[PDB]
Amino acid sequence: QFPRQCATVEALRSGMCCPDLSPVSGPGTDRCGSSSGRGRCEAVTADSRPHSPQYPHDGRDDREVWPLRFFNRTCHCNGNFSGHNCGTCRPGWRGAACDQRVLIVRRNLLDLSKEEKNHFVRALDMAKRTTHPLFVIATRRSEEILGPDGNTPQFENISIYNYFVWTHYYSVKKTFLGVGQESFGEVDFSHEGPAFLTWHRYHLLRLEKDMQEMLQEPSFSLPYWNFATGKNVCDICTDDLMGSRSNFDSTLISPNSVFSQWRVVCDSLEDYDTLGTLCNSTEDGPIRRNPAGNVARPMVQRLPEPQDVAQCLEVGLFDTPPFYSNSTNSFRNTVEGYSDPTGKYDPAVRSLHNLAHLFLNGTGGQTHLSPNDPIFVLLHTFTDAVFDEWLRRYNADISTFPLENAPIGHNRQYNMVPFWPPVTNTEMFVTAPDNLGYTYEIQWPS
C-alpha cells in the first residue's frame, strides 16, 4: 500500500505519488529528492502484456496493471538511491550517498545464541505493536477510496508486522464483482505462478528493512527455519522461540510465549467478499496453531524430508508452461509445493513450502491469514534460501520466467502487488549476496 503522503484526496486525484524529501523551499519543491540528485517524479511503467485466460474480469480489479488504478506517476530514483522518496538506499547500500556496502547474514534460528533468540522474538513482538512509519492500508477499493463524503481517504494506520500480513492478504483476496454476486477466486497475485518466489522475496526484504529501522540496527537479519527435516513436530515451537502448544487448548500457543497475546488481522472474509471491503487494522482472535494436527489429512502431518530439498534443487528450469500450480518440472512449482520434489505434478501432492504451511493445521495454513502466525517469516526465509541457492546454481536464468500469458500478476514485468514503490519480479531475480545485501548461512544435503 501507499506512503501516507499519498493517501490523500489531492494525491489520488492527481494520480501522482511523488512525495517531497526535504521541502526547504515549500511543498512540492523536492519531489523524489530532485533538489539533490536523488531522483525524479516520473511516469509509471506497468506490465501491459497479456495474461492467461483464467482471469476473465479485466477492468474489474484494482490489482490489474499495478499501480495504475491509483497512481500513474511515481518516484524513480537515480543510481543506488531508493524508496518512495528516493530518500533511502537500494538493498545492500547505506550511508547518505548510498555508497557503503552492507552484507547481512540470515542464519538458522536454532543456531542463534540465547540472547539472539530472545532479541529476535522481542523484535517480532515490537513490530506487531509499532505503527508503520511510512505505509497506510486501504479499507476500501478504488471506487470508495475517498470515502462516503468524497473527501475522507479510507486508509488506516497499521503496525509494521500487520502490514506484512495485509499485503499478503491483498495479494490473494478474491475479485469483488458486486453485492449479490459471488466473488471470483481463481486469481492469486503471489501464489500459483512464477511470481511466487520473487513476490515473497521482496516481502521478506521489506519486513527486514522495516525492522532494521524500527530497531535502529542496520545489520539485523531475519533467521530461517529448516523445516525440511522429516519431523513429526515443530522444532521451533518452543517458548523461547515461536511458542509451544497450550496445555489448556491444543490449538492455541502456550501463554508463556508472547505470541499467545497476538491478535490477527484479515479474518473476516465473509464481510470482505460480500460487502466489497478490504481487511482493516482491527485485530480479532488469537493465532491458532496445531502442528501435525490435521488428522483428516495425513499427508500434511509430517514435514518435508531433507532429500526433498536436494531433489527440487535439481530442477533446472525456473518455470514451465502453463506457469501455474499444475506445471511439471518447474523449480518454482516444485519448491512452492504443488509438484513432488522431482518435479512430477499430481493434484494431490503437497510438498516443501505448501507442506510446511499445512503442517501447522491452523492460522499458518490458511491462505488469507498465514502471515499472522510469525512462523511464516521463518518458513519463507528458508524458502527464499532454497531459491537463492537455485539462483547461484543455474546462473540466475530468468529466461523461463514468462513475459506473457502467465496468470495475472505473474508476468515477469508485473509490479508485484501491492508493494511500493513499484518493483518488478525482475528486480528480485538476482543472487542475493551480490545484489540485495544479504546471504544465507546454510549447508545443503547432497
Ligand X SMILES: *[C@@H]1O[C@H](CO)[C@@H](O[C@@H]2O[C@H](CO)[C@@H](O)[C@H](O)[C@H]2NC(C)=O)[C@H](O)[C@H]1NC(C)=O
Ligand Y SMILES: *[C@@H]1O[C@H](CO[C@@H]2O[C@@H](C)[C@@H](O)[C@@H](O)[C@@H]2O)[C@@H](O[C@@H]2O[C@H](CO)[C@@H](O)[C@H](O)[C@H]2NC(C)=O)[C@H](O)[C@H]1NC(C)=O
Ligand Z SMILES: *[C@@H]1O[C@H](CO[C@@H]2O[C@@H](C)[C@@H](O)[C@@H](O)[C@@H]2O)[C@@H](O)[C@H](O)[C@H]1NC(C)=O
Residues at the annotated binding site?
Answer: 168, 191, 200, 353, 357, 380
Q: Min. distance of Cβ 46 from ligand Y in angstroms?
A: 10
Whole-number Å distance between alpha carbons of 74 and 77? 10
3-state secondary structure of 51: coil
Task: Identify what 354 binds: ligand X, ligand O=c1cccccc1O, ligand Z, none; CB under 5 to 8 Å per kind.
Answer: ligand O=c1cccccc1O
Task: Identify what 72 binds: ligand Z, ligand O=c1cccccc1O, ligand X, none; CB under 5 to 8 Å per kind.
Answer: none
Residue 294 as a binder of ligand Z (CB under 6 A): the answer is no
Whole-number Å distance between alpha carbons of 416 and 374? 22
The stretch near ligand Y (CB under 6 A) out of 45-53, 63-71, 106-114, 310-318 is: 63-71
Question: CB within 8 A of 61, min separation 6: which ones?
Answer: 175, 176, 187
Cβ–Cβ under 8 Å, residues 265 and 131: no
Residue 70 as a binder of ligand Y (CB under 6 A): the answer is yes
Q: Which is nearer to ligand Z, 22 or 152 (CB)?
A: 152
At position 366, the amino acid (one-letter code) is Q
Choose, by CB under 6 A, the member of 28, 37, 133, 218 that binds ligand Z: 133
**Inter-CA distances, 177 with 145, 168, 181, 185, Å:** 17, 21, 6, 11
Whole-number Å distance between alpha carbons of 92 and 80? 9
Q: What stretch of H or E contains 327?
A: none
Residue 362 as a binder of ligand X (CB under 6 A): the answer is yes
Sign of CA dihedral 380, 46, 84, 148: negative
Per-position x/- string for 341-360, each x denoting binding to ligand O=c1cccccc1O as judged by CB under 6 A, each - no binding? -------------x--xx--
User: Which residue ranges are tagged as binding site for Zn(2+)?
Assistant: 168, 191, 200, 353, 357, 380
Q: Min. distance of Cβ 360 from ligand O=c1cccccc1O in angstroms?
A: 9
Q: Say if residue 431 is exposed, middle or buried (CB neighbours under 10 Å; 0-12, 13-18, 19+).
A: middle
Whole-number Å distance between alpha carbons of 422 and 241? 34
Choose, by CB under 6 A, the member of 191, 206, 288, 332 that binds ligand O=c1cccccc1O: 191
Whole-number Å distance between alpha carbons of 32 and 40? 5
Task: Identify what 362 binds: ligand O=c1cccccc1O, ligand X, ligand Y, none; CB under 5 to 8 Å per kind.
Answer: ligand X
Q: Min. distance of Cβ 325 from ligand O=c1cccccc1O in angstroms?
A: 10
3-state secondary structure of 101: strand
Whole-number Å distance between alpha carbons of 156 and 139? 7
Pairing state of beta strands 2-3 and 131-138?
Answer: antiparallel
Task: Identify what 326 binds: ligand Y, ligand X, ligand O=c1cccccc1O, none; CB under 5 to 8 Å per kind.
Answer: ligand X
Residue 143 as a binder of ligand X (CB under 6 A): the answer is no
Choose, by CB under 6 A, the member of 5, 35, 72, 157 that binds ligand Z: 157
Cβ–Cβ under 8 Å, residues 318 and 208: no
Residue 329 as a binder of ligand X (CB under 6 A): the answer is no
The stretch near ligand Z (CB under 6 A) out of 115-123, 131-139, 180-188, 297-305 is: 131-139
Interacting residues with ligand Z (CB under 6 A) = 4, 131, 133, 136, 155-157
Q: Which residues bind ligand X (CB under 6 A)?
A: 53-54, 139, 268, 271, 277, 280, 282, 284, 290, 293-296, 322, 324, 326, 361-362, 365-366
